[PDB]
Amino acid sequence: SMEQVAMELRLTELTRLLRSVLDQLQDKDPARIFAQPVSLKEVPDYLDHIKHPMDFATMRKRLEAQGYKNLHEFEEDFDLIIDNCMKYNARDTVFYRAAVRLRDQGGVVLRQARREVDSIG
C-alpha cells in the first residue's frame, strides 16, 4: 500500500536524523571508550555485573537495520552506554569520568533532536 510506503519514508527519515545524532554523540567520545562492546575475553566477569551491555557499534548496526522506531528507543540505548559504565567503574576512574562527560555533552544534542523529531513529525 501507499500508506506503508509513507510510513517507510518516515522511518527512513528518522533513521537519517538518528544517524546524524549518533555521529554527533560519538564525537563527544574522542578516546573511543564507548566505540565497541566491552570484551568478555578482557573482562570475563562483565555479564555478572552488567545485564544489558551497549556500545556505539551495536547501536549503529541497529540503526542501519532501521531498528529504532522512535527517539525514545535510541535514547534508551545511549543511556545504557552511560549507565553501565557508571555502575561498573568507580567514580575516580577515567572510564566513569568519560561517561559523565558524554552524558553532559550528549544532553545538548538530544535536547535539539527531540525538537526536530516533534517539529518534522
Curated annotation (Swiss-Prot):
The record places domain Bromo at 9-113
Positions bearing the Glycyl lysine isopeptide (Lys-Gly) (interchain with G-Cter in SUMO2) cross-link: 41
- Going by the entry's taxonomy, the superkingdom of the source organism is recorded as Eukaryota
Q: In which tissues is it expressed?
A: Highly expressed in testis.
Indicate where this protein resides in the cell: Nucleus; Chromosome
Q: What does this protein do?
A: Scaffold subunit of various histone acetyltransferase (HAT) complexes, such as the MOZ/MORF and HBO1 complexes, that acts as a regulator of hematopoiesis. Plays a key role in HBO1 complex by directing KAT7/HBO1 specificity towards histone H3 'Lys-14' acetylation (H3K14ac), thereby promoting erythroid differentiation.
Task: Quote the subunit structure annotation.
Answer: Component of some HBO1 complex composed of KAT7/HBO1, MEAF6, ING4 and BRD1/BRPF2. Component of the MOZ/MORF complex composed at least of ING5, KAT6A, KAT6B, MEAF6 and one of BRPF1, BRD1/BRPF2 and BRPF3. Interacts (via PHD-type zinc finger domain) with unmodified histone H3. Interacts (via PWWP domain) with dimethylated and trimethylated 'Lys-79' on histone H3.
Q: What is this protein called?
A: Bromodomain-containing protein 1
Organism of provenance: Homo sapiens
Q: Which residues of the full protein are shown?
A: 555 to 674 of 1058
